[PDB]
Design a protein around this motif. Structure first.
Motif, PDB file in Angstrom:
ATOM      1  N   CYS A 166       0.841  -1.172   0.000  1.00  0.00           N
ATOM      2  CA  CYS A 166       0.000   0.000   0.000  1.00  0.00           C
ATOM      3  C   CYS A 166       0.883   1.232   0.000  1.00  0.00           C
ATOM      4  CB  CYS A 166      -0.915   0.015   1.221  1.00  0.00           C
ATOM      5  SG  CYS A 166      -1.634   1.663   1.536  1.00  0.00           S
ATOM      6  N   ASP A 167       0.729   2.050  -1.035  1.00  0.00           N
ATOM      7  CA  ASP A 167       1.370   3.347  -1.114  1.00  0.00           C
ATOM      8  C   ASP A 167       0.318   4.360  -0.701  1.00  0.00           C
ATOM      9  OD1 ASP A 167       2.634   5.710  -1.689  1.00  0.00           O
ATOM     10  OD2 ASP A 167       2.961   5.275  -3.810  1.00  0.00           O
ATOM     11  N   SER A 168       0.407   4.797   0.552  1.00  0.00           N
ATOM     12  CA  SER A 168      -0.572   5.710   1.135  1.00  0.00           C
ATOM     13  C   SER A 168      -0.420   7.143   0.620  1.00  0.00           C
ATOM     14  CB  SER A 168      -0.509   5.672   2.668  1.00  0.00           C
ATOM     15  OG  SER A 168       0.824   5.803   3.141  1.00  0.00           O
ATOM     16  N   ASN A 169       0.660   7.404  -0.117  1.00  0.00           N
ATOM     17  CA  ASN A 169       0.888   8.705  -0.761  1.00  0.00           C
ATOM     18  C   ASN A 169       0.160   8.861  -2.093  1.00  0.00           C
ATOM     19  OD1 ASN A 169       4.099   7.991   0.365  1.00  0.00           O
ATOM     20  ND2 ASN A 169       2.903   9.668   1.260  1.00  0.00           N
ATOM     21  N   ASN A 170      -0.369   7.758  -2.619  1.00  0.00           N
ATOM     22  CA  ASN A 170      -1.105   7.821  -3.875  1.00  0.00           C
ATOM     23  C   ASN A 170      -2.540   8.265  -3.618  1.00  0.00           C
ATOM     24  OD1 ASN A 170      -2.821   6.893  -6.207  1.00  0.00           O
ATOM     25  ND2 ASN A 170      -0.795   6.400  -7.041  1.00  0.00           N
ATOM     26  N   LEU A 171      -2.866   9.462  -4.106  1.00  0.00           N
ATOM     27  CA  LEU A 171      -4.175  10.062  -3.864  1.00  0.00           C
ATOM     28  C   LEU A 171      -5.257   9.590  -4.828  1.00  0.00           C
ATOM     29  CD1 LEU A 171      -3.087  11.665  -1.508  1.00  0.00           C
ATOM     30  CD2 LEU A 171      -1.777  12.568  -3.460  1.00  0.00           C
ATOM     31  N   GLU A 172      -4.864   9.216  -6.047  1.00  0.00           N
ATOM     32  CA  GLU A 172      -5.821   8.763  -7.058  1.00  0.00           C
ATOM     33  C   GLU A 172      -6.397   7.394  -6.734  1.00  0.00           C
ATOM     34  OE1 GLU A 172      -4.534   8.620 -11.246  1.00  0.00           O
ATOM     35  OE2 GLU A 172      -6.616   8.740 -11.916  1.00  0.00           O
ATOM     36  N   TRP A 173      -5.573   6.517  -6.164  1.00  0.00           N
ATOM     37  CA  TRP A 173      -6.005   5.144  -5.897  1.00  0.00           C
ATOM     38  C   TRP A 173      -5.744   4.803  -4.429  1.00  0.00           C
ATOM     39  CZ3 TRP A 173      -8.607   4.379 -10.116  1.00  0.00           C
ATOM     40  CH2 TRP A 173      -8.106   4.844 -11.346  1.00  0.00           C
ATOM     41  N   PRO A 174      -6.538   5.393  -3.505  1.00  0.00           N
ATOM     42  CA  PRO A 174      -6.255   5.165  -2.087  1.00  0.00           C
ATOM     43  C   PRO A 174      -6.450   3.715  -1.647  1.00  0.00           C
ATOM     44  CG  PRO A 174      -8.312   6.364  -2.346  1.00  0.00           C
ATOM     45  CD  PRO A 174      -7.706   6.271  -3.707  1.00  0.00           C
ATOM     46  N   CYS A 175      -5.616   3.283  -0.713  1.00  0.00           N
ATOM     47  CA  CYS A 175      -5.695   1.935  -0.167  1.00  0.00           C
ATOM     48  C   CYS A 175      -6.964   1.753   0.646  1.00  0.00           C
ATOM     49  CB  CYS A 175      -4.491   1.653   0.719  1.00  0.00           C
ATOM     50  SG  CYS A 175      -2.888   1.991  -0.033  1.00  0.00           S
ATOM     51  N   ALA A 176      -7.639   0.630   0.425  1.00  0.00           N
ATOM     52  CA  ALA A 176      -8.814   0.288   1.202  1.00  0.00           C
ATOM     53  C   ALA A 176      -8.316  -0.293   2.512  1.00  0.00           C
ATOM     54  CB  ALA A 176      -9.662  -0.712   0.467  1.00  0.00           C
ATOM     55  N   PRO A 177      -8.833   0.206   3.641  1.00  0.00           N
ATOM     56  CA  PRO A 177      -8.328  -0.267   4.934  1.00  0.00           C
ATOM     57  C   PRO A 177      -8.427  -1.782   5.119  1.00  0.00           C
ATOM     58  CG  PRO A 177      -9.711   1.668   5.218  1.00  0.00           C
ATOM     59  CD  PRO A 177      -9.853   1.262   3.781  1.00  0.00           C
ATOM     60  N   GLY A 178      -7.372  -2.364   5.680  1.00  0.00           N
ATOM     61  CA  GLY A 178      -7.295  -3.799   5.930  1.00  0.00           C
ATOM     62  C   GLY A 178      -6.945  -4.634   4.715  1.00  0.00           C
ATOM     63  N   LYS A 179      -6.943  -4.024   3.529  1.00  0.00           N
ATOM     64  CA  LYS A 179      -6.741  -4.797   2.303  1.00  0.00           C
ATOM     65  C   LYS A 179      -5.263  -4.910   1.951  1.00  0.00           C
ATOM     66  CE  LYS A 179     -11.150  -5.628   1.680  1.00  0.00           C
ATOM     67  NZ  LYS A 179     -11.740  -6.995   1.649  1.00  0.00           N
ATOM     68  N   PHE A 180      -4.912  -6.023   1.317  1.00  0.00           N
ATOM     69  CA  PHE A 180      -3.546  -6.308   0.926  1.00  0.00           C
ATOM     70  C   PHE A 180      -3.452  -6.427  -0.598  1.00  0.00           C
ATOM     71  CE2 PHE A 180      -3.249  -7.074   5.318  1.00  0.00           C
ATOM     72  CZ  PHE A 180      -1.932  -7.326   5.676  1.00  0.00           C
ATOM     73  N   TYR A 181      -2.510  -5.705  -1.179  1.00  0.00           N
ATOM     74  CA  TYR A 181      -2.335  -5.690  -2.631  1.00  0.00           C
ATOM     75  C   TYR A 181      -1.068  -6.435  -3.047  1.00  0.00           C
ATOM     76  CZ  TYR A 181      -5.831  -2.072  -1.953  1.00  0.00           C
ATOM     77  OH  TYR A 181      -6.947  -1.396  -1.562  1.00  0.00           O
ATOM     78  N   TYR A 182      -0.777  -7.549  -2.379  1.00  0.00           N
ATOM     79  CA  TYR A 182       0.297  -8.430  -2.837  1.00  0.00           C
ATOM     80  C   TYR A 182      -0.076  -9.077  -4.183  1.00  0.00           C
ATOM     81  CZ  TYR A 182      -2.810 -11.733  -0.373  1.00  0.00           C
ATOM     82  OH  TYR A 182      -3.908 -12.445   0.069  1.00  0.00           O
ATOM     83  N   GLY A 183       0.876  -9.768  -4.792  1.00  0.00           N
ATOM     84  CA  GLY A 183       0.711 -10.283  -6.162  1.00  0.00           C
ATOM     85  C   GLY A 183      -0.422 -11.275  -6.278  1.00  0.00           C
ATOM     86  N   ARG A 184      -1.253 -11.093  -7.304  1.00  0.00           N
ATOM     87  CA  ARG A 184      -2.338 -12.024  -7.583  1.00  0.00           C
ATOM     88  C   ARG A 184      -2.443 -12.240  -9.082  1.00  0.00           C
ATOM     89  NH1 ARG A 184      -4.454  -8.855  -3.500  1.00  0.00           N
ATOM     90  NH2 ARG A 184      -5.355  -9.883  -1.666  1.00  0.00           N
ATOM     91  N   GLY A 185      -2.781 -13.458  -9.458  1.00  0.00           N
ATOM     92  CA  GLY A 185      -3.029 -13.770 -10.856  1.00  0.00           C
ATOM     93  C   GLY A 185      -1.758 -14.056 -11.625  1.00  0.00           C
ATOM     94  N   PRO A 186      -1.910 -14.384 -12.920  1.00  0.00           N
ATOM     95  CA  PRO A 186      -0.781 -14.819 -13.753  1.00  0.00           C
ATOM     96  C   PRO A 186       0.346 -13.795 -13.891  1.00  0.00           C
ATOM     97  CG  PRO A 186      -2.872 -15.405 -14.759  1.00  0.00           C
ATOM     98  CD  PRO A 186      -3.182 -14.441 -13.662  1.00  0.00           C
ATOM     99  N   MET A 187       0.023 -12.512 -13.759  1.00  0.00           N
ATOM    100  CA  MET A 187       1.049 -11.485 -13.830  1.00  0.00           C
ATOM    101  C   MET A 187       1.450 -10.983 -12.448  1.00  0.00           C
ATOM    102  SD  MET A 187       2.806 -10.491 -16.473  1.00  0.00           S
ATOM    103  CE  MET A 187       1.884 -10.283 -18.000  1.00  0.00           C
ATOM    104  N   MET A 188       0.886 -11.581 -11.398  1.00  0.00           N
ATOM    105  CA  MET A 188       1.193 -11.151 -10.032  1.00  0.00           C
ATOM    106  C   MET A 188       0.994  -9.639  -9.846  1.00  0.00           C
ATOM    107  SD  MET A 188       1.771 -13.707  -8.043  1.00  0.00           S
ATOM    108  CE  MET A 188       1.616 -15.441  -8.457  1.00  0.00           C
TER     109      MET A 188
END
Length: 244
Positions: free
Chosen positions: A97-119
């Protein structure tokens, strides 16, 4: 359509160990899910002559097989037969989570580690990907690893989307990318090497991680042989500067 470029038989021959008990996403990545996802991206695998279309598919599976591999020196049939062994990152400790990104704010409690064929990773990629796919990936990133159509869509989205300074992988592999003067100076020429560079150049290219690049190449060369196409020039990125 795509089914005439890559058959079900070919798909499972490439990914011949992903439904083995020794893998971790058994039954998740299906041929049907792949064909369905590709429909959201009509030019993918449908641009150019048959050899070009096959080369695109080989390149896409070469890179994604590496991102998801369970292979090693002693893996049955060779390391380059162990693509699609994982559907998400093993290490789930970092929320990415990059909390400095204002356009795409992190949803609380959520994890954006690699998912899917391209991770797919980070709030700043789940955001634009979700926007473009019409999905709530920023609010609920876990859908990228629970729904195989969405999983493949995230990978194909990455493949098709330019992210300046990067061209899309699609444009490179279909001979639609014209390198800039800066690219030329930096040794970034059309081929599989620059695709590796687009995906993870900063950590791998210019000789930073020869092992990972060689695994990417090993999958690609295998798949090109199975499709009956030439992997082409500029396959390695050891003499390319990373994009910025």
């Amino acid at each position: 359509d795509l089914s005439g470029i890559i058959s079900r038989d070919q798909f499972y021959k490439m990914l011949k160990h992903m439904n083995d008990n020794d893998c971790h996403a058994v039954g998740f990545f299906t041929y049907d899910a792949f064909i369905t996802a590709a429909k959201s991206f009509p030019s993918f695998g449908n641009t150019g002559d048959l050899a070009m279309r096959k080369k695109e598919i080989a390149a896409f599976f070469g890179q994604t097989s590496h991102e998801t591999t369970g292979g090693w020196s002693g893996a049955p049939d060779g390391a380059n037969t162990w693509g699609y062994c994982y559907k998400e990152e093993i290490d789930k400790s970092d929320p990415h989570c990059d909390s400095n990104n204002l356009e795409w704010p992190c949803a609380p409690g959520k994890f954006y580690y690699g998912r899917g064929p391209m991770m797919l990773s980070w709030n700043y990629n789940y955001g634009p990907c979700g926007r473009d796919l019409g999905l709530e990936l920023l609010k609920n990133p876990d859908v990228a690893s629970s729904d195989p159509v969405i999983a493949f869509k995230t990978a194909i989205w990455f493949w098709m989307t330019p992210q300046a300074p990067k061209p899309s992988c699609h444009d490179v592999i279909t001979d639609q990318w014209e390198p800039s003067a800066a690219d030329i100076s930096a040794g970034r020429l059309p081929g599989y090497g620059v695709i590796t560079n687009i995906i993870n150049g900063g950590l791998e290219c210019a000789g930073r991680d020869v092992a990972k690049v060689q695994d990417r190449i090993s999958f690609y060369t295998r798949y090109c042989g199975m499709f009956g196409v030439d992997p082409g020039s500029n396959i390695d990125c050891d003499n390319q500067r990373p994009f910025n």
